C-alpha cells in the first residue's frame, strides 16, 4: 500500500541508474579501444626510431670509412711524392758535385 | 502471493548481479592502471631514443667534419710534394743537360 | 658452421697477407726507381769523361805539334846564326892579320 | 647456395690472378738482376774514364812544361848568337876601314 509505493520507486531509481550505468561503459569501452589504438601508435614509433637509429649508425660509421679510405690513399700518394723528391735531390746534388769537380772537365792550358 | 516470491527473486538476482558488476569493474579499473604504466614506459622509450638519434647525429657530424679536416690538410700536403717533385724534375733534367752539352763545348 | 669459421679466418688472412704483399711492391717500386735514376747519372757522366778525354787529347795534340813547330823553327834560326858567326869569326881575324902585317913590313 | 657459389667463384678468381703475379714477380726479379750487373758495368766505365782523363792531363802538362822549357832554352841560345853576329859584323867593317886608313 505505502510500502509498495516506496518499492515502485526503488526499483524505479534502479532502472534509470542501469540505464546510466549502460552509457559510462560504453565511454569506458571506448576508451580502452582508444588507450588500445594509442599504445599501438606508440609502439610503431619505437620500432620507426630503432629503426632509423641503426639507419644512421649504418650510413654513418659508412661516411667515416668511405673518408679512411681517402686519408690513407692519401697517405700512400705522400709517401710516393715524398720519396721520389728525396731521390731526386740526391741525383741532383750528385750532378752538381759533379759538374763543380771539373776534373770531369779537360784542363784549358 | 506466488508473484511476491517471484519479485524477491528478480531483486535477488540483480542483488547477486551487481556483486558481480563490482568485481568486473575492480578488473577493468586494475586494467586502466596497468595500461597506464606502459604507456609511460612506452612514452620514456621515445624520449630515450630521440635523445640518442639526437646524440648519434651530432656525433657522427662532428667527426665527419673532422676527417674532412684532415682530407684537405693532406690534400694540400700532396700539393707541395708534388709541386716539390716537378722542380727536381726539372732542375734534374737541366744538371744532366748542362754535362752533356758542357763537355760539347767544355 | 665450424668449417665456415675456417673459410672466413681463412679468408681473413689472405686479406692480410695481400697487405704486406702491397707494402712489398711498394719497396720493390721504388727499388727500380731509385736504381732508374742512378744509372742515368752514371751514364750521363760516362757522356760528360768521354767528351773530356777527346777533348782532352784534342788539346793535347794540338798544343804540342804547334811548339814543336816552334822548336824546329828556333833550331832553323840557330842554324843560320851559328853559321854567320862562324864565317865572321874567319873574315874578322883575316882582316885583324892583315892590318898587323901591313905595319909589319909597310 | 647462391652466396656461396659466389664466394668460391671469387676465390677462384684470387687463385689464378696470383699465378698471374708469381709469373709478373719472375720477369720482376730477371729484370732487378740485368739492372744490377748494367750498373756495374757502367759504374766501372766511369773508373776506366776518370783514370784516363787523368792519365791525359798528366802526359799532355808535363810535356808540354817539358817544351816551353827547350823553347826558352832556344831562345836563349838565339840571343847570344844573334848578338855576336851584331858585334862581329861590325868589327869587321871597323877593321875594313882601318886597313882602308892603312
Same mark, same amino acid.
Given at each position: ?5 516506496? $518499492? ?7 532502472? =534509470? #541508474? &542501469? ?11 571506448? $576508451? ?8 599501438? &601508435?606508440? =609502439? ?7 629503426? +632509423?637509429? !641503426?639507419?644512421?649508425?649504418?650510413? $654513418?660509421?659508412?661516411? #667515416?670509412?668511405?673518408?679512411? $679510405?681517402?686519408?690513407? &690513399?692519401? =697517405? ?8 721520389? #723528391? ?5 741525383? =741532383?746534388?750528385?750532378?752538381? #758535385?759533379?759538374?763543380? !769537380? ?5 784542363? +784549358?792550358?
Amino acid at each position: 500500500s505505502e510500502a509498495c509505493r516506496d $518499492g515502485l520507486r526503488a526499483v524505479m531509481e534502479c532502472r =534509470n #541508474v &542501469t540505464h546510466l550505468l549502460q552509457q559510462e561503459l560504453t565511454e569506458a569501452q571506448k $576508451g580502452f579501444q582508444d588507450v588500445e589504438a594509442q599504445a599501438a &601508435t606508440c =609502439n610503431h614509433t619505437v620500432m620507426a626510431l630503432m629503426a +632509423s637509429l !641503426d639507419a644512421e649508425k649504418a650510413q $654513418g660509421q659508412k661516411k #667515416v670509412e668511405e673518408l679512411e $679510405g681517402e686519408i690513407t &690513399t692519401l =697517405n700512400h700518394k705522400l709517401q710516393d711524392a715524398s720519396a721520389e #723528391v728525396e731521390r731526386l735531390r740526391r741525383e =741532383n746534388q750528385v750532378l752538381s #758535385v759533379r759538374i763543380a !769537380d771539373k776534373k770531369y772537365y779537360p784542363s +784549358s792550358q
